[PDB]
Amino acid sequence: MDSLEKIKEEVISCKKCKLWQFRTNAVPGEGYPKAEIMFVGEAPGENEDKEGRPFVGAAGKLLTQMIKEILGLERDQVFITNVVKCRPPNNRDPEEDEITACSPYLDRQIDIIMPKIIVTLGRHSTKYIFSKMGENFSSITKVRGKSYVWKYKEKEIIVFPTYHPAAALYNPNLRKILEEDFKKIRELAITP
Numbered sequence: 001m002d003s004l005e006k007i008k009e010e011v012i013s014c015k016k017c018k019l020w021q022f023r024t025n026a027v028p029g030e031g032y033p034k035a036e037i038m039f040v041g042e043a044p045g046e047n048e049d050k051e052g053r054p055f056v057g058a059a060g061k062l063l064t065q066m067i068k069e070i071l072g073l074e075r076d077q078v079f080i081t082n083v084v085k086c087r088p089p090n091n092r093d094p095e096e097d098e099i100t101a102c103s104p105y106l107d108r109q110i111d112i113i114m115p116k117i118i119v120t121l122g123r124h125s126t127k128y129i130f131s132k133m134g135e136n137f138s139s140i141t142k143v144r145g146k147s148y149v150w151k152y153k154e155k156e157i158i159v160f161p162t163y164h165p166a167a168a169l170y171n172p173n174l175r176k177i178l179e180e181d182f183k184k185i186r187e188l189a190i191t192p
């Protein structure tokens with residue numbers, strides 16, 4: 001039967017799409033298997049590729065700070081991954097065939113974890129999860145900052161799209177919006 005350990009083993013040696021040829025390390029994701037909050041980013045950047053870990057660049061440091069200061073959580077208490085788990089060449093966006101190849105890993109991670117909340121960081125992860133939900137995706141600007149109920153198996157999962165933290169690094173206005181969004185995520189997390 002499936003497990004997060006099995007998914008990690010498969011990802012680390014995966015050659016299911018052409019992205020494998022460009023990587024230093026695949027990035028399977030990390031965190032608590034019973035996380036109430038699951039964060040899903042786009043694809044690994046350069047530092048993520050180097051470390052084999054999600055959100056470790058400057059952007060990841062900001063994410064960590066927001067999780068700590070606004071949500072009141074350590075990274076070990078949440079689960080963090082990416083819709084595509086290898087760094088696209090020259091940091092381009094992932095192709096549709098790459099998302100198709102890799103996203104079953106994310107499906108399997110969600111299946112196992114069944115978080116209360118999935119926070120989709122950026123337009124690619126948001127569009128992907130919306131496609132799985134059957135929810136209409138317009139743009140990240142139009143859908144961010146709202147909760148969407150995803151009836152999934154026996155449970156309800158709250159999907160909360162926001163901007164990717166890298167977008168907030170050098171943009172004070174967008175960072176305040178991201179912070180406000182994390183405040184809303186906090187309220188959702190603590191409310192029965």
Ligand code: SF4
Binds near residue numbers: 020026084086102
């Ligand atoms: S991006 Fe995903 S599907 Fe493609 S090689 Fe890496 S782990 Fe496999």
